[PDB]
Design a protein around this nucleic acid. Structure first.
Lengths: 168, 284, 56, 169, 159
RNA sequence: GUCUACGGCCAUACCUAGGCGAAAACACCAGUUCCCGUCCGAUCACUGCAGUUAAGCGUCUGAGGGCCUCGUUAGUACUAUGGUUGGAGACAACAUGGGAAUCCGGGGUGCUGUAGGC
RNA sequence: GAAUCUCGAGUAGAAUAAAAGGGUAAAAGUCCCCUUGAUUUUGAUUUUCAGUGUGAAUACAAACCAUGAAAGUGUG
RNA sequence: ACCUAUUCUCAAACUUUAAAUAUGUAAGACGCCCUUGUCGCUUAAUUGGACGUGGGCCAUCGAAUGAGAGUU
């Protein structure tokens, strides 16, 4: 059967990285199963509230739970500490994002928790590390994400992609 | 992209010799696999290989560590016994096989017991065992990758080794002059190839028909002024000289001098500090 | 029908007893060519020992 | 200073006659190849059955011959008179080979036979350098290096210098 | 329900190793096996002749018979409440020498050696292996190794 | 040290671009009488050395792809034993033991046996 | 790119009678040549097992042969 | 519609890798070393192979612990 949820990224999904530093995660605290139908309902609720309050272009919402396990329908098998939703916004929309996820907690079974991530947006680096590497030029945005400098590969193949990178 | 990182990751290389195209492990397995109930009995192989200008005949035993050479001879040793020209022809293969057989039997200790055919008349024969003595030294031929077609130099080396006193089981189906239709061996043709008459016929016809081919194709022979008809006696004398003294002589080459000459030309690999020095010196 | 609960307990009641190990095994199961050889060698060895005992 | 032995030389010229049908017409085409090449042509069979061409699998449909050496050069030159020494830049493959098809063969010096008819066929010249044995031999087979491989432009230049032909771009 | 074929449920046991497919190494045929030798059975999927049953994969036994291209191995199989001698004719492609028996033979050679020099010197030699003894008393110096005091770390939210 | 023949483990050996290779050896190569096989001596088979290092081959370079090791991941994930432990359950913690994997970073880009040749 | 064949790459992504899995690249695949080891006689093993039968299988031995230059391989 | 570097998330019949627990064997006197005999098997060959002979080392006799044990 087709999953009730089809769109997993909402809002300004084409936005860059540097303008949306703050990231807030709705994570499941319990090992449970979440139906695709419930995921769709929370997606509608989160999108509606965020657009109503902060507008369409002030957020990017990503649903990290994918209902692949079959039970008639599909459910998303989640573990303890597994992220369910992730919203990246500016620093000013912290209260709006927290309230949006808190309201959507009622649409999910079990226990869900809101945690403000120490990582810069959706990147794997902390905010201070991302700022330092952005200043040093090892990070270049690419659409909704950014490419990071790595030691491997040819020197020309990395220099042409990263022109302003200041190697020591 | 046809060659991607997953493709190289999943790529399983053939063996080193199979990559180099030097050995056939399918044939090597059956050649060297000794019966387990015979325990440590070695299985000797007559490996015969041909370059563009030389013949390499070897007798090899197989071990876990690697292949061991019992006796050897190179076609470049023929000028010592008289044969200077055609060091890769059918006759040279026969002579090298004879030389390898003599050296192996001398090392084994059967030279005085199995003399073989002193005068090759072209008759197909096998070295029969002594009733109350040791059986002949049994060796099996290894052609390598050379095709097994009638009149090949590989079977010429086999014939030379067999006449030298070794026991190489074989049939005349591959010797030159064997007629497939009549299932008969032409002993006259085999004797002609043994004594190099197939080259003498080539020389005389070229002289008769196209001498322009003659001076350049047979330049080595013409340089010393040796014609076709005395090739037979030259080879017969070479066989006699091989039989009388088959010992192998080591060259007085200066290995240390060659080491000094080659260490100058070998390139030394750059170290990590040199790599990073070349690295940043190019970045600047 | 069918279970394996008690069978291991029932098995170790009288131990998992090993077969008796004898010094000589049967030359059956062996190669016939090897087996008939060993007859002739053993026959000669018996004769050699007896003759040596007789002459000593 | 270019090494003289890398001079480009003709390897083989393949003459292919594909009629799309079997029978006496193919046999007469085989004789035509026999007279043109002096060699026995090989009958090419169908790999697959195709209804739109009326072709059934395993049926002898085509006849091809391969000429190598001085005769190949002469036959190539004979076809070049028919082509007026004009070949498009498209005719040269990236591997270094080229080809051209000739609809009418009587101009090739072949006497017209009403019982034989007119057959169209394809010339295909395969280009090589001395050293291709390294890839074509059994023992110690290897890959030809990049610096020794042949490009379409290299074939175009060699064709232009040797035959004074014009290649349309 | 089951299917009881000889090669049933041998998908992963008889599978060739990753990037180890292809031609079998030639050194397998150049090893001599004698009666009384200890051998480990490891079925090679490439050679489908002389294969033992999937029970005997990973089992170690003593060679009792040596054949032209095969080896007779004596395995003890648990059948109910007893051990049964199982005599498997397995080709040498699926057989390898047991490194344990080698190591034992080298240890026997060493023990006989140590005994020889012990008798030559008139001393008694300790030949029996001992389990690891309890740790001995020893001093630990703190020079340039001053102990650092550790405290358990507070909880943090890092996903 | 370099080359050849036969190999052992079978990528530190593979794939790719570029730069070198003195000697010998090897290879490219000339030819189709014969042995021999093809549509075609191009492959294979046979006779020879007139030129050539263009390629094969050997070697070097690339923060190359890959591969092999060491560390990070990590005492993390997981797991054997224990409790009249917690919790409605899900599951979690603790006590006594065992203990990975990817990502990531550092290093490495064949070694060697017998017989020979330079 | 030429009115089907041509050369570049090509770790098997194809084939291997039939279900599925395993195995296979100078082959176990596709062609070609010769062939009847798909034969006779023992015992000994393996599997399902009571270590009974049946069935299938493995390694030999005594003959007789096929094949290959040979090593060797072949009792469907 | 692709291709390139990425990115989000999964697999009972998918997998490079790969535990924990269970699992096969060995840990010697039927041992070791030397000498030496038999054979119709085996090898180029007393060369091997298998069984032996006559000697020599000799309960710290080759890990810990505990028990007498096995068969009809």
């Amino acid at each position: 059967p087709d999953s009730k949820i089809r769109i997993f990224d909402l809002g300004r999904k084409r936005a860059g990285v540097d303008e949306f530093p703050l990231c807030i995660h709705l994570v499941s605290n319990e090992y449970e199963q979440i139906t695709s139908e419930a995921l769709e309902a929370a997606r509608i609720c989160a999108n509606k509230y965020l657009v109503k309050i902060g507008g369409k272009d002030s957020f990017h919402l990503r649903v990290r739970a994918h209902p692949f396990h079959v039970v008639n329908g599909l459910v998303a098998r989640v573990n303890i500490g597994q992220i369910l939703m992730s919203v990246r916004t500016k620093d000013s929309s912290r209260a709006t994002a927290i309230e949006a996820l808190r309201r959507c907690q009622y649409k999910f079974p079990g226990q869900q928790r809101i945690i403000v991530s120490k990582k810069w947006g959706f990147s794997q680096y902390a905010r201070d590390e991302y700022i330092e590497k952005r200043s040093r030029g090892e990070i270049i945005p690419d659409g909704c994400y950014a490419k990071f400098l790595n030691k491997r590969g040819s020197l020309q193949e990395k220099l042409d992609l990263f022109p302003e990178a200041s190697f020591n | 992209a046809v060659k991607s990182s997953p493709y190289f990751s999943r790529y399983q290389t053939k063996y080193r010799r199979r990559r180099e195209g030097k050995t056939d492990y399918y044939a090597r397995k059956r050649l060297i696999a000794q019966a387990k109930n015979k325990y440590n009995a070695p299985k000797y192989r007559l490996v015969v290989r041909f370059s563009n200008r030389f013949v390499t005949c070897q007798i090899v035993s197989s071990r876990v560590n690697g292949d061991y050479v019992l006796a050897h001879a190179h076609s470049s040793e023929l000028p010592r016994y008289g044969i200077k020209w055609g060091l890769a022809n059918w006759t040279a293969a026969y002579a090298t096989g004879l030389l390898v057989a003599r050296r192996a039997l001398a090392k084994v200790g059967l030279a005085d017991k199995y003399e073989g055919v002193t005068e090759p008349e072209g008759e197909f024969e096998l070295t029969e065992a002594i009733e109350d003595g040791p059986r002949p030294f049994k060796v099996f031929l290894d052609v390598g990758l050379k095709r097994t077609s009638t009149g090949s130099r590989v079977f010429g080396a086999m014939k030379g080794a067999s006449d030298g006193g070794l026991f190489i089981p074989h049939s005349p189906n591959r010797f030159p002059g064997f007629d497939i239709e009549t299932e008969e061996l032409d002993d006259e043709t085999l004797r002609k190839y043994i004594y190099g008459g197939h080259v003498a016929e080539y020389m005389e016809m070229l002289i008769d028909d196209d001498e322009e081919r003659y001076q350049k194709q047979f330049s080595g022979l013409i340089a010393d002024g040796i014609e076709s008809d005395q090739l037979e006696d030259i080879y017969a004398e070479a066989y006699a000289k091989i039989r009388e003294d088959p010992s192998f002589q080591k060259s007085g080459k200066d290995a240390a001098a060659f080491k000094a000459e080659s260490l100058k030309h070998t390139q030394r690999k750059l170290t990590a500090e040199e790599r990073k020095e070349r690295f940043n010196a190019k970045v600047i | 029908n069918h279970t394996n609960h008690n069978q291991n307990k029932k098995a170790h009641r009288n131990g998992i007893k090993r077969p008796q190990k004898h010094r000589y095994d049967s030359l059956k199961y062996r190669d016939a060519k090897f087996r008939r050889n060993q007859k002739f060698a053993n026959r000669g060895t018996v004769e050699a020992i007896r003759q040596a005992k007789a002459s000593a | 200073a270019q090494n003289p032995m890398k001079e480009l030389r003709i390897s083989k010229l393949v003459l292919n006659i594909s009629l799309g049908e079997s029978g006496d017409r193919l046999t007469r085409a085989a004789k035509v190849l026999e007279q043109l090449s002096g060699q026995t042509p090989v009958f090419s069979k169908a790999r697959y059955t195709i209804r739109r061409f009326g072709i059934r699998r395993n049926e002898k449909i085509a006849c091809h011959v391969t000429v190598r050496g001085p005769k190949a050069e002469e036959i190539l030159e004979r076809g070049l008179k028919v082509k007026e020494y004009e070949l498009k830049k498209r005719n040269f493959s990236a591997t270094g080979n080229f080809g051209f098809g000739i609809q009418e063969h009587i101009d090739l010096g072949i006497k017209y036979d009403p019982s034989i008819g007119i057959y169209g066929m394809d010339f295909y010249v395969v280009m090589d350098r001395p050293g291709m044995r390294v890839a074509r031999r059994k023992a110690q087979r290897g890959r030809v290096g990049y610096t020794h491989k042949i490009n379409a432009e290299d074939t175009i230049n060699w064709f232009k210098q040797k035959y004074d032909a014009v290649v349309l771009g | 329900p089951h299917s009881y074929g000889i090669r049933a449920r041998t998908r992963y046991t008889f599978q060739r190793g990753f990037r180890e497919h292809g031609q079998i190494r030639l050194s397998t045929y150049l090893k001599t096996y004698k009666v009384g030798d200890i051998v480990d059975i490891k079925v090679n999927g490439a050679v489908q002749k002389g294969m033992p049953h999937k029970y005997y994969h990973g089992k170690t036994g003593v060679v009792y018979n040596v054949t032209q291209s095969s080896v007779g191995v004596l395995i003890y199989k648990v059948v109910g409440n007893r051990y049964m001698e199982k005599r498997v004719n397995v080709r040498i492609e699926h057989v390898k020498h047991s490194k344990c028996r080698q190591d034992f033979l080298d240890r026997v050679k060493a023990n006989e050696a140590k005994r020889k020099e012990a008798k030559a010197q008139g001393k008694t030699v300790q030949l029996r292996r001992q389990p690891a003894p309890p740790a001995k008393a020893h001093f630990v110096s703190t020079e340039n190794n001053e102990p650092v005091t550790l405290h358990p770390v507070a909880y943090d939210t890092t996903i």
